[PDB]
């Protein structure tokens, strides 16, 4: 079964993005007087994606082994009219 997916993009790359941008802004500020991102992404990268299937969607079952009903059913004629 499959449907719409969440890849968790943000909680995967936010660590690196925030660290890089904040470090760069700090360096710019220091210059304006006149690696951690790798370490974060190393742990935040492999978060398995999550599947959300809308309820009420049609599905099918591929009968993978033969089914026997000799124990639970039998047939008989019905009278005419």
């Amino acid at each position: 079964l499959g449907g719409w997916i969440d890849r968790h993009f943000w909680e995967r790359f936010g660590g690196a993005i925030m660290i890089s941008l904040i470090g760069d802004l700090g360096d710019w500020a220091s210059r304006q007087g006149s690696s951690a991102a790798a370490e974060a992404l190393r742990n935040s990268i492999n978060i398995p994606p999550t599947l959300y299937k809308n309820q009420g969607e049609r599905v099918n079952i591929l009968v993978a082994r033969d089914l026997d009903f000799s124990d639970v059913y039998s047939l008989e004629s019905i009278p005419t009219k």
Partner: protein, 50 residues
């Protein structure tokens, strides 16, 4: 009977990125003293796991 009491538990916490915790229900008690041990997974409002 409606109003029966159900006990359940959970353990281990979450792993990063997850958004749901898995609870197992242990026992149900009808006010009239019926006790049966059912082990089944807790679900959200729409039967979604955890």
């Amino acid at each position: 009977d409606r109003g029966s009491k159900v006990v359940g538990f959970y353990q281990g916490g979450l792993r990063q990125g997850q958004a749901r915790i898995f609870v197992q229900w242990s026992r149900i008690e009808t006010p009239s003293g019926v006790v049966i041990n059912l082990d089944s997974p807790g679900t959200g409002p729409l039967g979604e796991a955890g």
